Ligand binder design. Structure first.
Ligand SMILES: CN1C[C@@H](Cn2c3c(c4ccccc42)C(=O)NCC3)CC1=O
Length: 125
């Protein structure tokens, strides 16, 4: 009914950290996760429960911070850009599905503002 949970662990992928991946987990994710607006974004959108039966028709690639958090904890990302893309996909999804001015879009905008500020201080590759 809902799409399967996105993959958060990669078998046979070696454990490798980078400065940027460390920053994305220990600074960026940590700051966004504790924000008062984080909660709609802490797990996949359950469009069946939330009565959004057109959501998956519009959103071909769902993404959320719970998935990102698990991916970072599991060292699923090969590089920081994959993780940054997941954050960007999450925000884009919100902006192309919901009416501007709806609470959820205002919440996404506040989280993205903080995200982009932290990304301005991303360590150089
Ligand atoms: C990440 N999500 C959550 C989904 C459910 N949803 C919506 C609002 C909303 C507000 C607070 C929690 C969930 C909310 C809102 O303002 N207008 C309608 C949609 C839509 C979406 O893209």
């Amino acid at each position: 009914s809902n799409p399967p949970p996105p993959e958060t662990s990669n078998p046979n992928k070696p454990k490798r950290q980078t400065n940027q991946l460390q920053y994305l987990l220990r600074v960026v994710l940590k700051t966004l996760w504790k924000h008062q607006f984080a909660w709609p974004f802490q797990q996949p959108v359950d469009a069946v429960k939330l009565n959004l039966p057109d959501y998956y028709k519009i959103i071909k690639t769902p993404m959320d911070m719970g998935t990102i958090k698990k991916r970072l904890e599991n060292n699923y990302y090969w590089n920081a850009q994959e993780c940054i893309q997941d954050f960007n996909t999450m925000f884009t999804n919100c902006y192309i599905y919901n009416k501007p001015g709806d609470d959820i879009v205002l919440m996404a905008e506040a989280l993205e503002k903080l995200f982009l500020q932290k990304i301005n201080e991303l360590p150089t590759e």
